[PDB]
């Protein structure tokens, strides 16, 4: 069952993301795949990966909708695509 | 595929490099600076795109079925070749651009030509190589003609061009006409005709002239 | 820091096999995809193939399709390009390059992949029907007609060698100003041939000696011949 992604740390240049997989299944499956990008433009994924439950995506573009998705490393399913906006 | 393949400008001149695309969907646009004789290097990914302390320099966008890399204030280092790269959404394949080159626009230069007769030592082997040198000229675009006894030569010569000199930005060119010792010994006039614009210059040597 | 040191190369004959290997220090492999691209000398770039080391997802190019086989080992932190059924066109300098990550990235949004951030260095891969051969060196001397207060062009012709490269020096390197060592060209038969020239004032012509130092490391040939006016 895919992780659930939500935001608590928006900024002008910073978008800080958080996910919360349920504890029963917390088999701590390696790392978490945070697959972010811009919108329909500059394609540099700049994807970051971490085993924790939250990431602080830095050096982001102001007043831009970045597209984000979190995937369980799968060493099996990824989360739904999410759209967040900088400040 | 790029619409330009070889260009020229001067220091500080804002230049525009283009590259044809496959369209499909608005896809990735990565260009590389292959400095001649080194290895391809990525500029950087910085939204506006550059290769320095977040400057503009190498900046690009998208224009139609092509993409662009227009740099504003041209500096010496930048002079190199550039390739546009994409990621197709088919079999995860990778296409590439034809490859564009940048030359330093220098005042029209004179092709100083000196012709060389095949050394006597070589003739012993049975091969005759007459070489023609186009020293320190610009533009690279030129036309060399080999006439033996006033007979234009076809399918018998090979050409080589150096890379631009680092100070004056000229070129040196060698056109090598390989002949058989037999054919060489049966002829007398050996000329290498160069056509650099509307002034076509010839340099010749006669078998035995010394 | 992070590198993509490649290996292999040398010489193999048409209808041959050369397994290319690219090590990888510094970067955590498996995620950063390994890419093979050829830079045929004189021409431009040609993408060979790509694979995702951890998941091992194969991606080949039509030019080389089927001929080659790409693979890698996460433990070895290294990739492998198996070259089989080599043909004449396959002659090129092969390049190793690293890409981005994100299983989602490779899938779904692939067309939005970042560029080859980190490249390799190149190792010569020549496929020809010959063997290691030492060059023949012949002189290219001027005459007394070429005077014009300082104009005398002379040089050396390094003919019929294989494989590339050859190093050319003039008077043990001392003579460097004016030297125009041309890039190598191949003769129709299939042997490498270049020329190296230098311009000198028509005063020192005899006084100054001119020894072109040629070296063909491939066949450990070291030619140190002098160019005399004729």
Author numbering:
A (entry chain L): 438 to 512, 516 to 527
B (entry chain G): 5 to 32, 39 to 58, 66 to 72, 74 to 80, 83 to 220, 223 to 232
C (entry chain C): 1 to 9, 11 to 35, 40 to 64, 67 to 72, 74 to 238
Sentences copied from the publication:
The receptor tyrosine kinase EphA2 interacts with ephrin (Efn) ligands to mediate bi‐directional signals that drive cellular sorting processes during tissue development. The Eph extracellular domain (ECD) consists of four subdomains: the ligand‐binding domain (LBD), the cysteine‐rich domain (CRD) that includes a sushi domain and an epidermal‐growth‐factor (EGF)‐like domain (Arora et al., 2023), the N‐terminal fibronectin‐3 domain (FN1), and the C‐terminal fibronectin‐3 domain (FN2). Efn ligands bind to the LBD and sterically seed clusters of Eph ECDs, which then drive forward signaling through tyrosine autophosphorylation of the Eph intracellular domains (ICDs). To elucidate the details of the mechanisms of Eph receptor clustering and activation, we developed a panel of synthetic Abs targeting the ECD subdomains of EphA2, and produced monovalent Fabs and bivalent IgGs to either negatively or positively modulate signaling.
Using optimized Fab frameworks, we solved the structures of Fabs L1, C1, and F1 in complex with the LBD‐CRD (left), CRD (middle), or FN2 (right) ECD domains of EphA2 at 2.6, 1.9, or 4.2 Å resolution, respectively. Examination of the Fab F1 interaction revealed an epitope on FN2 predominantly formed by the C‐D and F‐G strands and loops of the fibronectin type III fold. The epitope is also partially conserved across human Eph receptors, but again, is diverse enough to create selectivity for the F1 paratope. Though limited by the low resolution of the structure, a simple omit map at the core of the interface suggested that our model was well matched to the density and alignment of all four complexes revealed nearly identical engagement angles for each complex (r.m.s.d < 0.9 Å). In each complex, the observed interface was dominated by residues from CDR‐H3 with minor contacts from CDR‐H2 and CDR‐L1. To further validate our findings, we performed an Asp scan ( ) of the dominant CDR‐H3 of the F1 paratope, which revealed a six‐residue hotspot signature that contributed to the energetics of binding, consistent with the structural analysis. Sequence analysis of the natural paralog sequence variation revealed that F1 engaged a highly diverse pocket of Eph isoforms using the energetic hotspot residues. The Fab F1 epitope overlaps significantly with Efn‐binding Site 2, suggesting that the antagonist activity of Fab F1 is, in part, due to interference with zippering of anti‐parallel EphA2‐Efn signaling assemblies. We then asked if Fab F1 could sterically block tetrameric clusters of EphA2 by overlaying the structure onto models of EphA2 tetramers in register 1 or 2. Both registers of the EphA2 tetramer gave rise to steric clashes between FN1 and Fab F1 engaged to protomers responsible for proximal and reciprocal kinase recruitment (protomers 1 and 4 in register 1), while engagement to distal kinases created no steric clashes.
